[model samples]
Target: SINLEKAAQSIQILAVIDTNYIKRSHPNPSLNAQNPTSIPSTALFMLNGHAPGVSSSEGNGNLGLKLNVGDKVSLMGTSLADNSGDAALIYHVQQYSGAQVFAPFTAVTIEQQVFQAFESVAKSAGSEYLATSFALYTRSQNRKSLFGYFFWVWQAAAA
Candidate 1:
């Protein structure tokens, strides 16, 4: 029988951009407007930090993180679907992670929401899909970005 692979599975493109220097979307807009949901998948998953090795029951793979400084995104490699068809370039802004210790936002905080979002998408049920969420970030590359954006577009039309 066949095992599986996130690479082969169909998933969404959630970019975790790193915009160095604590810069949150001004005027908030309920923090939705700045969401990656507005970005398109074809949008580059701009590299963030050094490549880190990610593992799980499946195995191991070299995945990157958009987390490090002002902006950071936690990426889950195993989340990619086991095996089957696949999704293509699409984009979406999942969430933002700040506050080293406590992100007291709505009691959830920034890190809280970020970590929570990561778990939601990386777990088993969410893993069944090739939905790889990359946190591409830091002011180094300049503000450029998706989970919703690529996700909807992916749903709209994917590979």
Candidate 2:
């Protein structure tokens, strides 16, 4: 029933929005017992390309999006199938009080319709705490399989 070829053509880059001040810290040991330093965020979204620095000056400006945490942000992308054999890069855009308050856009899919359907649900939930980041993850077809993911974070233009 599932078409791998079709799914492989729907991948797209993601964006972040509606977030408070972003935070960058050493990976929490509890969430990453094996390799906290190597693991990305324990939260939903992870830095897409480069690792973020511990200090504001040393931080990568392009690493994450800056949002108000109360406004709606757009998730622009085509489909997940397009990223077959590739991993998606997602960013944590919102500022939460606890580790459990991360975004909920962790589902991966090849169906564009299914992806779009959730946009409405996110919109209805009020942008205050919506999933501010997204990414696509796909598995390789090679006998020695591995994952390759990618994502992008763009800032909204001035109105």
Candidate 3:
């Protein structure tokens, strides 16, 4: 018999890819035209050390910087367990060469159902109750020169 409690409790991080290592092109031509020149574009870097079990793959988990308008940068972190039934991923972004940590973003919760699904797959696969990988991406669409952005995170368990 599978322990529902154990099944619900088995979510882990497999890897974290820092955004600094990725290169993306800008989505908007106007923004691209002004970059590094008249507009003086700035790069924003985020460090993912807000949670206890979470950490970066690089130095102190410091994510280097956002490189492009559609830059889908991965955070630097490692595999870890979510002890509490709930988990929050935290991050804060700062300007390159800037002294202050500006505009700290709040943590995003991984829903209970998502955790259960991951554990179910792990159990079925005869593998340890753990998530094998996780990734995040930023998506956007343009309409009549107007644009919107959306962020999504994905997790996978070995099965």
Candidate 4:
């Protein structure tokens, strides 16, 4: 017998929250110069449910930053100008009743779904897709959405 579970709510679009800098957080004692603040103060974008092991030829691999539940990391996505990578345009988050955390910027959609379908799945999926680290392009012009095609994912350990 086929036990069928109804498909979850669909996610059309998602707003990319670029945490390039500390937007807001509690003050910590390890921010001094000598201490050097081991805390990761880089940028991070929230994306969940993306598939794993996907690649892009136009620019380079997937553009958006990938995140997981327990990983302590910072992430950032590229600007939409360069077209270097696809981004989470819609502000929708995936909701699973049994999942410990509510994934904000991640999900695995079909390849024929949308522009970011392929890469999105590659970046966010089951435990197989969890990447320990990644690199972010620091091009000055790529920082702003109005400048160049800044659509690459950057990630680092969180403070």
Off by over 4 Å in 1: 1-14, 17-39, 46-108, 111-118, 121-127, 130-159
Q: lDDT for every model?
A: 0.24, 0.27, 0.24, 0.27
lDDT of 3 at 46: 25
Compared with the true structure, the alpha-carbon lDDT of candidate 1 equals: 0.24
Off by over 4 Å in 2: 1-70, 76-82, 89-138, 142-159
lDDT of 4 by residue, 1-159 (tens): 896643332222222433233223312322222222211313333343332222112122322333333332222233333225423232122221222222334433435634432112222333221221222223344462311111222221110
Lowest-lDDT window of 10 residues in candidate 2?
A: 49-58
Model 1 Cα lDDT, one tens digit per residue, 12-93: 2233332211123211212333343333333323222332232121111212222111122232211222101121222222
lDDT of 2 by residue, 50-148 (tens): 112111111232323322222233344322233333333343333222222224444344474344312211212111322333333334455322122
TM-score for every candidate vs. truth? 0.21, 0.26, 0.19, 0.22
Candidate ordering by TM-score (highest first): 2, 4, 1, 3
The global Cα lDDT (0 to 1) of model 2 is: 0.27
All-Cα superposition RMSD per candidate: 15.7, 14.8, 17.0, 14.1
* Candidate 3, backbone clash total: 8
Question: What lDDT would candidate 3 get against the real structure?
Answer: 0.24
Q: Candidate 3, residues 1-159: lDDT per residue as tens digits?
A: 876432222223222333222213323322221122111112122233222223333222232221212112222232122312112222322123332222222234457544221111122221111111222223234212212121222221122
Q: How many backbone overlaps does candidate 1 show?
A: 39
Flag the better candidate by TM-score, 3 or 4. Answer: 4
